[PDB]
Amino acid sequence: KAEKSLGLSQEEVIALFEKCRNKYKEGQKKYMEIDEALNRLHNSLKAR
Amino acid sequence: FILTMYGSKFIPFGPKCQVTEYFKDCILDISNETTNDVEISILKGILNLFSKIR
Amino acid sequence: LQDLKKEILDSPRSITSNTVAKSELQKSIKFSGSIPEIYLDVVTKETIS
Amino acid sequence: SHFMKGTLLQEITENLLYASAIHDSAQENMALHLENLKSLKAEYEDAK
């Protein structure tokens, strides 16, 4: 009954959560790298 | 330091002074104009202006 | 997987370039007034002079 | 144009303009990535 209410198999949902967490972590790292690069480029552009 | 020193008897304004020429030579050596601190460009301009002053 | 997920739930799930510096400047301001955020942003983002 | 090219200021202006264009494109892509990261964060909040 819980599975039919959720629809997707719990193993699939937990694997999707794990991959989503990995994607969130890599996206956060990419966002931080892009933000740092943009800030460094902005400071370099102002200095130049 | 450069702003403080100039205008005195020891470091007077003038194109013929050797000290200003040496300072300009050093600033031109460090200056690259691609990835440089603003202070280097400001020093170059100020030294040129002081050299031009008679 | 359930016990691993329980430890994963313990881990936080789902810019701040100058937030700390701007916040600390705002807290120690000694001024009774508007103190617009633009002033704090321009003061805390010089990076040159 | 002749004065700028002779004094090696034209190349500095071209490099600055190219860097400024790259910065503007990077800022637009950073805004798109922030929107995508917020959409991914909402999807991951739904996954949570």
Side-chain angles (χ1 to χ4, degrees), chain B residues 9-42:
Chain B
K9 180 256 175 180
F10 314 106
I11 310 292
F13 308 105
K16 292 308 175 291
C17 183
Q18 301 296 89
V19 186
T20 175
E21 290 298 330
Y22 166 70
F23 287 172
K24 287 187 304 177
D25 290 329
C26 293
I27 293 300
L28 261 63
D29 291 331
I30 48 161
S31 61
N32 189 26
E33 221 52 49
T34 62
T35 47
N36 302 84
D37 298 331
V38 188
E39 292 82 3
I40 300 180
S41 59
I42 296 179

Side-chain angles (χ1 to χ4, degrees), chain D residues 2-8 10 12 15 21-22 24 26-27 29-31 33 35-37 39-41 44 46-47:
Chain D
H2 280 298
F3 178 82
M4 294 295 287
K5 182 180 54 60
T7 53
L8 297 182
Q10 183 176 0
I12 304 176
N15 298 334
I22 291 301
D24 296 1
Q27 185 173 359
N29 197 17
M30 167 72 162
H33 286 347
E35 297 293 335
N36 299 329
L37 187 59
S39 64
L40 287 183
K41 177 174 300 182
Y44 303 155
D46 300 329

